[PDB]
Amino acid sequence: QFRALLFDVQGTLTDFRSTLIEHGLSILGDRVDRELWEELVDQWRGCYRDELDSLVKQEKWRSVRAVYRDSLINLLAKFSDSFCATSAEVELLTDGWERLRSWPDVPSGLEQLRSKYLVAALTNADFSAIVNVGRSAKLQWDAVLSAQLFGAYKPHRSTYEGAATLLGIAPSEILMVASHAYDLEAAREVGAGTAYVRRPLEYGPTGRTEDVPDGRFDFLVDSISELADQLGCPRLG
Amino acid sequence: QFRALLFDVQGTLTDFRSTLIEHGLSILGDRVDRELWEELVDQWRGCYRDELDSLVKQEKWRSVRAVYRDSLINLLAKFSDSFCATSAEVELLTDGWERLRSWPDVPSGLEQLRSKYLVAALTNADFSAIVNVGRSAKLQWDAVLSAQLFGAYKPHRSTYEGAATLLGIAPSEILMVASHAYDLEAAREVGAGTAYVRRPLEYGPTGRTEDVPDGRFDFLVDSISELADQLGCPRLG
């Protein structure tokens, strides 16, 4: 069936929200409260995807770190009555995105898959960012692929097809793995397999995610270890 | 001093000659004698080098797999009196270059360096080839980089500069590691440190290797683990 598994990373494998909440509360200290900062974090994620959505239609690529920084600065202006931050603090706050921890199933799941499949990241994050998160989130890849290599973000066909060309495999022999349906739907359009990972805590203990029904994608799992089971990979020691 | 180590792979970390000799004898069996096959492998490697030297001068890039395949077809014609190969066998023999075994020091040496440094591959081999070599050679990277990503082979400055921009690290904070002096000299020009790894068996128990004196490059070692020691990395368990 498949030769390689292509992974979305942010949210799919990493809990970005907990880190950005705790990191921002560490940096800003007594100057911001949980509900103020949590509301900021949630609008920040929206601003990034809205800018990335705009860039895809326009067929342009830019530093994704710069996207995060630009949208944070815009949000800090909105909240300028409540608190402020220096340029250095804006840099440290923006760095939170590159210190993500992975969900607890991920490292054992990724290793268990490596016995039958090549495992690569295909991320919209900049190349250096995914390399950096790899250390804090304990990710170990066969290859790292980023929108920066292709000059185009997912859901663009160029990213999935370029990933397949670089890997030397037909798109039909890629299983694409993601906790975001848009990413899986685009991969299906190039012939790739689809595997959805439910992440109920991706947007916090409250706040819900897509209750995906069975049969929309080829697999629907609650962990990478579970996906590995269904792909004929044995459990580790 | 250094944030990342950039590794050449073929030869520096992998014994391509032992691999291709035993790989060919497995495919061809009794139809060729070992000493004859050894002569083809040594000329095959020579063809590959002469071809890459000319493509570098012309500033062109082409699939390195096709370089191996086209040069093999020429040598099979030259040796056609002694043995022959089917079209399928030509593909299998060319696959040997994507199944290289690593020198015995390398896997633990790479692991020991990961405690303090980012480790990435930078090879002239195509992207799919270096991914496959990671399994056969048991290499574990933070990132994998290929001349295919840049449309230019080492020693072109664009390859070292592209790697630095992809990893987000200043070339002065990159240590280049190789058993080939051309590669280290070119990285020195871009601003990186240099580490020469002596591989006397790279071209066989017979044949010869390069002369590097002490003080020509920043480090001169006999194994990756020695390099890690000289870089302040604690030993493994």
Author numbering:
A (entry chain A), B (entry chain B): 11 to 247
Give passages from the manuscript.
Microbial epoxide hydrolases, cis-epoxysuccinate hydrolases (CESHs), have been utilized for commercial production of enantiomerically pure L(+)- and D(−)-tartaric acids for decades. All these three CESH[L]s exhibit high sequence identity (>60%) with L-2-haloacid dehalogenases, which are members of the haloacid dehalogenase (HAD)-like superfamily. Studies have shown that both RhCESH[L] and KlCESH[L] adopt a two-step catalytic reaction mechanism by 18O-labeling studies.
Two molecules are present in a crystal asymmetric unit, and gel filtration experiments showed that both enzymes form homodimers in solution. In RhCESH[L], the key residues involved in hydrophilic interactions include R124, R145, Q150, and D152, while L128, F137, V141, L159, and L176 participate in hydrophobic interactions. Furthermore, similar hydrophilic and hydrophobic interactions at the dimer interface are also observed in KlCESH[L]. Interestingly, an intermolecular disulfide bond forms symmetrically between C94 from two adjacent RhCESH[L] molecules in the crystal structure; however, the aggregation state of RhCESH[L] remains unchanged in the presence or absence of DTT, indicating that the disulfide bond forms due to crystal packing. The core domains of both RhCESH[L] and KlCESH[L] can be well superimposed (with an r.s.m.d value of 0.944 Å), while there are some notable differences in the cap domain. Although the previously proposed catalytic triad of RhCESH[L] consists of D18, H190, and D193 (22), D193 should not be the catalytic residue in the catalytic triad because D193 does not form direct interaction with H190 in the solved RhCESH[L] structure.
